[PDB]
């Protein structure tokens, strides 16, 4: 056997789901690459982390050309 | 066209021994004497 290796799990994924109340600075999605793109009121980190710049409600809409998926914040 | 990177380019004159002169601007800076041209070439006429 010449196989026994693996790496620690990074705990990626959606942290806040749709309809939830966000506060500014909260982390929304942890990603490799941009599987979700930043919408209104959402910024992108230097490792493709989606966080919140304003307060409100998570939206999770897909729109526009290229058929992307957008995470935005709307008024509660 | 840019400035001061290209050769001087001038009108000159050309003369062929068959009694032919054609105007052509070029970079010789000196008129030259030709020997064969399209007026006197064999395979331009039918030989």
């Amino acid at each position: 056997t010449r196989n026994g290796r693996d790496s620690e799990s990074k705990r990626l994924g959606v942290k806040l789901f749709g309809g939830q109340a966000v506060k500014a600075g909260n982390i929304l999605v942890r990603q490799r690459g941009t599987k979700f793109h930043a919408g209104y009121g959402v910024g992108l980190g230097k490792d493709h982390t989606l966080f919140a710049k304003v307060d409100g409600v998570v939206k999770f809409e897909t729109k526009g050309a290229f058929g992307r998926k957008y995470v935005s914040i709307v008024a509660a | 066209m840019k400035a001061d990177i290209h050769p001087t380019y001038e009108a000159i004159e050309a003369t062929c021994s068959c009694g032919n002169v054609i105007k052509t601007r070029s970079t010789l800076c000196k008129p030259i004497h030709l020997d064969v041209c399209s007026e006197c070439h064999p395979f331009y006429t039918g030989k």
């Binding site: - | 054609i22 070029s26 041209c37 395979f43 331009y44």
Partner: protein, 176 residues
């Protein structure tokens, strides 16, 4: 020059020889690009400027060197290595070169009954070949390095090669 010769009579005659309706659809010649592919100088690097120095005299315009798009070691080259120079001639410079090509140098090279008329691609562009540069003037025979093979290409707004040949039938091309 040939520029006057073209638009004064070549265009009206060519308009009827093809049954064309619009004066905008008459074929026309846009640019002439020469180049010369230097397979050698991979181990010399010194003829490159000689190859450059030659090509302003022929054209009256400064050429530019082109590099290898890929390595391919069969030809013993590496990516980004100087392989050949090229020039582009447009508008008045190409017309005077064209006159300087039809009858100053083409009749006197060494040989040939003419030029083949099958050297057209599918879209009415003609390209020919020149074995020895010395066929041109302004390059004397007693101050040259080894003879090198310049190339000539013609680009025209001809939809197909049928009327592209008709346009090159004007300008009096020696076609066999």
């Amino acid at each position: 020059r040939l520029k006057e010769i073209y638009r004064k009579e070549i265009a009206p005659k060519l308009k009827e020889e093809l049954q064309l309706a619009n004066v905008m659809e008459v074929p026309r010649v846009t640019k002439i690009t020469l180049n010369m592919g230097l397979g050698e100088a991979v181990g010399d690097k010194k003829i490159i400027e000689n190859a450059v120095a030659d090509l302003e005299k022929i054209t009256g315009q400064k050429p530019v060197v082109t590099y290898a798009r890929k390595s391919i070691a069969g030809f013993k080259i590496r990516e980004g290595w100087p392989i050949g120079v090229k020039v582009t001639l447009r508008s008045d410079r190409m017309y005077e070169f064209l006159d300087r090509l039809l009858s100053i140098s083409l009749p006197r090279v060494r040989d040939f009954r003419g030029l083949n008329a099958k050297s057209f691609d599918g879209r009415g562009n003609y390209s020919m070949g020149v074995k020895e540069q010395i066929i041109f003037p302004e390059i004397d025979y007693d101050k040259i390095d080894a003879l090198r093979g310049l190339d000539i290409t013609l680009t025209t707004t001809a939809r197909t090669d049928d009327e592209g040949r008709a346009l090159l039938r004007a300008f009096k091309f020696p076609f066999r």
